[PDB]
Design a protein around this ligand. Structure first.
Ligand SMILES: Cc1ccc(S[C@@H]2O[C@H](CO)[C@H](O)[C@H](n3cc(-c4cc(F)c(F)c(F)c4)nn3)[C@H]2O)cc1
Ligand SMILES: [Cl-]
Length: 138
């Protein structure tokens, strides 16, 4: 089991055709998960499943620039389930991050941070047992 929060370096940042795979199991009674693709202190892409926001389950995505969150993008399709194993795949494409969970397309997030080769860390946080985090080129 990897330690959470986990820091996965992305050497030289990200690039289209780069596929990031995260495997884990959601804890019983989970409240939150977060993936943070960071450019230094900025968060280029925050992917944040919330298991209980006003008694609804929602995915919140955003960007943090100069310590300020921007406009959220919200996805009510919610593929996670407390207690169950999951796979998150984040495929970097030219205009967006494309996210699939358990081999089903979930959402795309347009690139707000444009210096892809500076987005050189992925943080993984929240209410999971983390099994593996890796990347490959497809
Ligand atoms: C003006 C204003 C006021 C409130 C807000 S709320 C805010 O909303 C953001 C998206 O817009 C992020 O989700 C933020 N956030 C979540 C997490 C986090 C950290 C963890 F360790 C986790 F394990 C985890 F799953 C999640 N860290 N930071 C959240 O605080 C926004 C603007
Ligand atoms: Cl949260």
């Amino acid at each position: 089991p990897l330690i959470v929060p986990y820091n996965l370096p992305l050497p030289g940042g990200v690039v289209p055709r780069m596929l990031i795979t995260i495997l884990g199991t959601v804890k019983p009674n989970a409240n939150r998960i977060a993936l943070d693709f960071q450019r230094g202190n900025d968060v280029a892409f925050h992917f944040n499943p919330r298991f209980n926001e006003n008694n609804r389950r929602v995915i919140v995505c955003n960007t943090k620039l100069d310590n300020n969150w921007g406009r959220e993008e919200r996805q009510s399709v919610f593929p996670f389930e407390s207690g169950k194993p999951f796979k998150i795949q984040v495929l970097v494409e030219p205009d967006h991050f494309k996210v699939a969970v358990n081999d089903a397309h979930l959402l795309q997030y347009n690139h707000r941070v444009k210096k892809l080769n500076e987005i050189s860390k992925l943080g993984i946080s929240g209410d999971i047992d983390l099994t593996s985090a890796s990347y490959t080129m497809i």
